[PDB]
Write an enzyme that holds these catalytic residues in place. Structure first.
Site, mmCIF file in Angstrom:
data_model
loop_
_atom_site.group_PDB
_atom_site.id
_atom_site.type_symbol
_atom_site.label_atom_id
_atom_site.label_comp_id
_atom_site.label_asym_id
_atom_site.label_seq_id
_atom_site.Cartn_x
_atom_site.Cartn_y
_atom_site.Cartn_z
ATOM 1 N N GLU A 357 0.851 -1.298 -0.074
ATOM 2 C CA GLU A 357 0.065 0.131 0.097
ATOM 3 C C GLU A 357 0.824 1.212 -0.078
ATOM 4 O O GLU A 357 0.475 2.426 -0.472
ATOM 5 C CB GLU A 357 -0.920 -0.242 1.227
ATOM 6 C CG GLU A 357 -1.804 -1.231 1.416
ATOM 7 C CD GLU A 357 -2.740 -1.640 0.399
ATOM 8 O OE1 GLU A 357 -3.080 -0.655 -0.510
ATOM 9 O OE2 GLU A 357 -3.051 -2.685 -0.018
ATOM 10 N N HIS A 487 -16.334 -10.223 -10.180
ATOM 11 C CA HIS A 487 -15.941 -9.236 -11.159
ATOM 12 C C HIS A 487 -16.983 -9.191 -12.397
ATOM 13 O O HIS A 487 -17.058 -8.205 -12.873
ATOM 14 C CB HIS A 487 -14.650 -9.164 -11.627
ATOM 15 C CG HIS A 487 -13.517 -9.077 -10.553
ATOM 16 N ND1 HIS A 487 -13.242 -10.023 -9.401
ATOM 17 C CD2 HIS A 487 -12.571 -7.836 -10.416
ATOM 18 C CE1 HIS A 487 -12.362 -9.467 -8.786
ATOM 19 N NE2 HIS A 487 -12.039 -8.422 -9.124
#
Ligand SMILES: CC(=O)N[C@@H]1[C@@H](O)[C@H](O)[C@@H](CO)O[C@H]1O
Ligand SMILES: CC(=O)N[C@@H]1[C@@H](O)[C@H](O)[C@@H](CO)O[C@H]1O
Ligand SMILES: CC(=O)N[C@@H]1[C@@H](O)[C@H](O)[C@@H](CO)O[C@H]1O
Ligand SMILES: CC(=O)N[C@@H]1[C@@H](O)[C@H](O)[C@@H](CO)O[C@H]1O
Ligand SMILES: CC(=O)N[C@@H]1[C@@H](O)[C@H](O)[C@@H](CO)O[C@H]1O
Ligand SMILES: CC(=O)N[C@@H]1[C@@H](O)[C@H](O)[C@@H](CO)O[C@H]1O
Lengths: 590, 181
Positions: A357, A487
């Site tokens: 991150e 998805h």
């Protein structure tokens, strides 16, 4: 009075009015996620509605300025993204129908619910109910039940909705000057108007097919090894020369083979590297972990984190004083605000997630000087690939031996190297055929090459051929197995997870070569290597201002996606896999 | 004479007033509750016992909880867009609060420029503060925008506010050049 000047001042006004509104929306959403209440969520919806209304109003106003007259690349590239009408092309009835279909599909996936008649009050949902069965259980019948129930209670009811969604999406795309919805999705990789750097929408299919053809031997050897190892766990359920059952792949869809590591570990006597105990004994809090990640990025040569990142971003779980959704995310709130939101625990997974991150934020700080529409990765796979290379070096034992988290006398031998490479290939190599298969199926279902009466036949034929996965129990044409994935049923392109995997090792090979690293590529950290940080930053700082081919060449020296860096990374494992498969069959029989 | 430092409403950090003198610092710091005394390239003992060619004391109002942004080496919003310490000559940054027995004017709240950038069709250029100078957003601070016109575009200033405490917390950046006690 020139059209160029009018477009320039229009974009000036749009950027002036979009930095404030986007920052307000990001602040509202961050306040909602950090502390969930009833007022915060309402503020988030109000900010999002205002931002969407502004975006639509500026998009309709953007069509006044033609692309063919604008000469500046920045102005032209901003106008390109501004004049993408999208769902606004469809009529009000069509747009409402499409939005409703998407909403019901998303709600059906989110509230997926399963329970046998024996206990209608003991119902199991996907997270974390069936996920635990698909990730941890070792029973063929139990996993088969958890697979069939999820694909017949949720997927069976998304079929007509997905058919109508496909029809409406194709209508919208073809009315927007695209061949179909697959062409619209592939339009992210399109580059035009740059000599020597152009990329066609249809070129992506050919490039992905070529790279997969080059990947195929390594995946076939890994698949043979995994099949041989699983034959010891399910003696009377897997054939030596056949495919792999879909429910025995470590998760619901077989997207990742990570949870197959316990069954397929090469050397179980030797334990893998885990520095969690070291940080437990050294009293490493969240602040220390994130400061170590910042030290890594500074040693590479990238800037340190802003002061506002250390005060406005919360790195630990606040407790019961405020509920928080702390899935680890990076936040570019706009106007120079960067914040990481994650519940950091003392664990090596959270130690590598900090680096992951931290690398997403570094991209944002790099392209923060770009216009709002150009503040993104070069293409959809650049951002996550950049994030994923920072955890490649962080997990390297050299990096762990330099920060004191690993014993300096630790014996790094070939057995631990093979174990680490097998663990990496289970998650990285095992997801590439799945991603390519799913995207190919979606691409030529949207293209109309697969009639709606051949959706489930073709999908499972792809699973057997490309992926070597056989369905446990035949499915006729009321199921929607692809819609069982997040998805597919939530309208997300999947090829971004393929190209990223090829970009991630393309950067790592390019950076390590810039770091003068000698030896295997998997044992490489770009720490203390400014020559690699400069090459990385020269691409990160561009954003979308330059074509993704040029941005790729800035680091790797090549204009196109390549697989040789990926195969070089798994070279020690490929030789070991080939030696281990000398007495077994490589490949699957359909 | 440090009377203007102690008399009158303290300005915001972006609108800091610089007082140059070309002294008895023991008395001056006696009636402030000094919380932090960070002296760079000079001892905290020698600032009041040395002759100087020229002495400058920059004073402004800024909350103690936000003082980490004014520390040396800080970067990003609120750290490079309001005031930057000048390290060319030895400095002494003092974060203090006037004592109860002394009366100080209390402003509405604490205001500072979170970010003063220049947005437009070609990107956002941050207008960072040079050491000893202002932010170029001083007259439109804390929140505002104007139209410079041309490649730069709009000069956007984004500000922040904080509810001020019962007493004002003020920052003094003392700089000397090589004024006798
Ligand atoms: C503990 C705390 O300060 N919470 C604040 C407060 O304004 C309120 O409790 C709520 C919004 O009404 O959420 C936060 O903004
Ligand atoms: C530049 C351009 O292609 N504009 C198209 C065109 O169909 C029309 O100008 C309008 C629809 O009414 O908006 C877009 O769909
Ligand atoms: C990258 C690029 O296209 N730059 C051009 C160039 O004319 C100049 O750098 C500036 C205007 O002075 O902005 C754009 O018009
Ligand atoms: C994927 C898997 O089966 N892991 C097992 C499981 O018992 C658990 O997740 C954990 C024990 O704490 O580690 C392993 O023993
Ligand atoms: C990765 C690497 O080479 N690090 C070196 C090493 O001497 C140590 O880890 C540390 C010393 O403070 O920083 C660098 O000098
Ligand atoms: C670890 C780190 O990033 N430190 C930074 C760096 O700019 C430098 O070490 C020093 C400035 O003098 O203090 C901080 O600003």
């Amino acid at each position: 009075s020139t059209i160029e000047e009018q477009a320039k001042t229009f974009l000036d006004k749009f950027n002036h009015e979009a930095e404030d509104l986007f920052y307000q929306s990001s602040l509202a959403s961050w306040n909602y996620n950090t502390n969930i209440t009833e007022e915060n969520v309402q503020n988030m919806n109000n900010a999002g509605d205002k931002w969407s209304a502004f975006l639509k109003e500026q998009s309709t106003l953007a069509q006044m300025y033609p692309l063919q007259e604008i000469q500046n690349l920045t102005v032209k590239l901003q106008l390109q993204a501004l004049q993408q009408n999208g769902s606004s092309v469809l009529s009000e009835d069509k747009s409402k129908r499409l939005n409703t279909i998407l909403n019901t599909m998303s709600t059906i996936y989110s509230t997926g619910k399963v329970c046998n008649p024996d206990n209608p009050q003991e119902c199991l949902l996907l997270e974390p109910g069936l996920n635990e069965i698909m990730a941890n259980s070792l029973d063929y019948n139990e996993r088969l039940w958890a697979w069939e129930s999820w694909r017949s209670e949720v997927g069976k009811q998304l079929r007509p909705l997905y058919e109508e969604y496909v029809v409406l999406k194709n209508e919208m795309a073809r009315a927007n000057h695209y061949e179909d919805y697959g062409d619209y999705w592939r339009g992210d990789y399109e580059v035009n108007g740059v000599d020597g750097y152009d990329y066609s929408r249809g070129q992506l299919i050919e490039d992905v097919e070529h790279t997969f053809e080059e990947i195929k031997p390594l995946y076939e050897h890994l698949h043979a090894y995994v099949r041989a190892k699983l034959m010891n766990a399910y003696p009377s359920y897997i054939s030596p020369i056949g495919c792999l059952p879909a429910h025995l792949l470590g998760d619901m869809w077989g997207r990742f083979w990570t949870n197959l590591y316990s069954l397929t570990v090469p050397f179980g006597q030797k334990p893998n590297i885990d520095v969690t105990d070291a940080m437990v004994d050294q009293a490493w809090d969240a602040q220390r972990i994130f400061k170590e990640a910042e030290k890594f990025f500074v040693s590479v040569g990238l800037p340190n984190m802003t002061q506002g990142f250390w005060e406005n971003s919360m790195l630990t779980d606040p407790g019961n004083v405020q509920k928080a959704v702390c899935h680890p995310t990076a936040w570019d709130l706009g106007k120079g605000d960067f914040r990481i939101l994650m519940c950091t625990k003392v664990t090596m997974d959270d130690f590598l997630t900090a680096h992951h991150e931290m690398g997403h934020i570094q991209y944002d700080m790099a392209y923060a000087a770009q216009p709002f529409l150009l503040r993104n990765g070069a293409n959809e796979g650049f951002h996550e690939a950049v994030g994923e290379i920072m955890s490649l070096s962080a997990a390297t034992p050299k990096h762990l031996k330099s920060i004191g988290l690993l014993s300096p006398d630790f014996q790094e031998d070939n057995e631990t190297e093979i174990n680490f490479l097998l663990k990496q290939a289970l998650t990285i190599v095992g997801t590439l055929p799945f991603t390519y298969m799913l995207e190919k199926w979606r691409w030529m279902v949207f293209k109309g090459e697969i009639p709606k009466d051949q959706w489930m036949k073709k999908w499972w034929e792809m699973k057997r051929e490309i992926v070597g996965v056989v369905e446990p129990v035949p499915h006729d044409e009321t199921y929607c197995d692809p819609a069982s994935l997040f998805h597919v049923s939530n309208d997300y392109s999947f090829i971004r997870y393929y190209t990223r995997t090829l970009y991630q090792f393309q950067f790592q090979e390019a950076l390590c070569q810039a770091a003068k690293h000698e030896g295997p590529l998997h044992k490489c950290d770009i720490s203390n290597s400014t020559e690699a940080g400069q090459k990385l930053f020269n691409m990160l700082r561009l954003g979308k201002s330059e074509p993704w081919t040029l941005a790729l060449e800035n680091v790797v020296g090549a204009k196109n996606m390549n697989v040789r860096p990926l195969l070089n990374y798994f070279e020690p494992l490929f030789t070991w896999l080939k030696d281990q498969n000398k007495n077994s069959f490589v490949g699957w029989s359909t | 004479d440090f009377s203007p430092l102690l008399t009158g409403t303290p300005p915001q950090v972006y609108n800091f007033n610089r007082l140059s003198f070309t002294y008895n610092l023991t008395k001056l710091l006696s009636l402030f509750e000094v919380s932090e005394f960070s002296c760079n390239a000079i001892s905290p003992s020698a600032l009041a016992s040395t002759c100087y060619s020229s002495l400058t004391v920059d004073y402004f109002a800024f909350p103690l909880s936000m003082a980490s942004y004014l520390r040396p080496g800080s970067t990003g919003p609120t750290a490079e867009f309001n005031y930057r310490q000048d390290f060319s000559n030895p400095t002494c940054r003092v974060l203090a609060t006037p004592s109860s027995n002394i009366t100080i004017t209390k402003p509405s709240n604490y205001n500072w420029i979170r970010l003063c950038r220049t947005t437009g069709a070609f990107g956002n250029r941050d207008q960072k503060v040079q050491p000893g100078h202002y932010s170029r957003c001083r007259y439109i601070a804390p929140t505002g925008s104007i139209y410079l016109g041309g490649n730069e575009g709009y000069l956007v200033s984004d500000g922040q506010s904080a509810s001020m405490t019962e007493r004002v917390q003020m920052t003094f950046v003392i700089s000397v050049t090589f004024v006798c006690p």
